[PDB]
Design a protein around this ligand. Structure first.
Ligand SMILES: Nc1ncnc2c1ncn2[C@@H]1O[C@H](COP(=O)(O)OP(=O)(O)O)[C@@H](O)[C@H]1O
Lengths: 209, 233
């Protein structure tokens, strides 16, 4: 059913949560410098998941947001996923400008979640996931590069098809189909370049003003 | 008519239940977190206790989405199976061993003994070892959870010309005869944290996928017996 979809999308926020709670429980609660901030995040994520379940049991909600530190926030949650508990670095290279863009926040945060999952999951044996936020031509470009298993150039098309998975562990293959679905739904475009064994780079373009 | 309709109706109530059964731990979660954010975290006497409850609830929903995902995969037919000839006897024995050894490492809340009564023949049978061992696991888990203290889980591996039978017997409080049909339905729980109401549902699904058939006999106040039947030669 469409149940399979909520099943899939709750995965990464459940992870974010379990990861943060485990951090607080492992002592961070005693630390006044951080424990509140973590609590705000666990709160925000729980509320996110509730919204998610409600919209999918019973539309887009476009609002203007500051893409820069939304992307920073998502990346923060993953930084905390990769801590606690191969080594991965999230190398961030954003423009210093604050690019504002019309999007659905929960849907788009789901997109970034899937693509960081991909960049990380198909990167065993370590890696450096490199995240770039820039703009040209009234478009806002996000790129995510990993030193993963790459993609055979034959399949570079099919990675956005439903259930389509490469040969080589895990998943139903609806991550990138949902991602493409959402990105096109927001008036933007998504694509991938990749070199088998080298790594990969995922791109999203969104209209700017 | 009622053909297509039973299908669509079952589907829509399953969606309604997934909505609720997912949403409810999220709600509980929200309440504890919100409590912690509103000061409880500064309090050493309560903050750990709350953090454990929130940890556990989160783990619960994770297991649930794993099971709702394997269930989607099985309805879809996406669920690939690998039938291979394996030794049912020592597979069932290895399962029982893992359970014996969890309780052999102590101190335990409740105490149970696993009584094994197997046929002496070495039954070789084509099955997917991993999915079927998951089945045996849910049913043993179940057998254990609804057991009294000192209870005896009675596990039988036997055979008939036509069949290979596994039974898992518990001395729990049994199942109302109204509900004997419903015990394998999704999210169906008798009363009841501790787990998702998808254990037995997955079990029945997997067993039918492996070509066998699964059912329950039970007497209120006495206990229960779960049966798995597999085709033999
Ligand atoms: N960095 C990456 N490197 C190599 N392959 C990738 C990468 N990201 C996505 N893919 C490919 O996309 C396929 C399916 O993607 P996805 O929808 O995310 O599946 P899943 O259900 O596991 O989440 C995968 O088989 C994978 O090979």
């Amino acid at each position: 059913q469409f149940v399979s979809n909520v099943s899939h999308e709750l995965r990464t926020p459940l992870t974010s949560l379990r990861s943060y709670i485990e951090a607080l429980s492992d002592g961070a609660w005693k630390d006044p410098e951080v424990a509140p901030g973590f609590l705000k995040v666990t709160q925000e994520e729980t509320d996110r998941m509730i919204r998610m379940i409600n919209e999918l049991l019973s539309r887009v909600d476009m609002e203007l947001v500051n893409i820069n530190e939304m992307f920073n926030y998502v990346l923060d949650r993953f930084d905390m996923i990769l801590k606690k508990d191969k080594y991965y670095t999230i190398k961030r290279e954003f423009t210093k400008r604050d690019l504002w863009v019309e999007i659905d926040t929960d849907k788009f945060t789901q997109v970034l979640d899937n693509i960081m999952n991909n960049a990380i999951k198909y990167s065993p044996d370590g890696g450096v996931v490199t995240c770039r936020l820039l703009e040209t031509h009234n478009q806002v470009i996000i790129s995510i590069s990993d030193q993963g298993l790459g993609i055979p150039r034959a399949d570079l098309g099919h990675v956005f098809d439903r259930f389509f998975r490469v040969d080589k562990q895990g998943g139903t293959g609806l991550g990138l189909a949902i991602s493409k679905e959402v990105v096109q739904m927001l008036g933007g475009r998504i694509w991938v370049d990749s070199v088998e064994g080298k790594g990969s780079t995922f791109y999203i373009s969104l209209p700017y003003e």
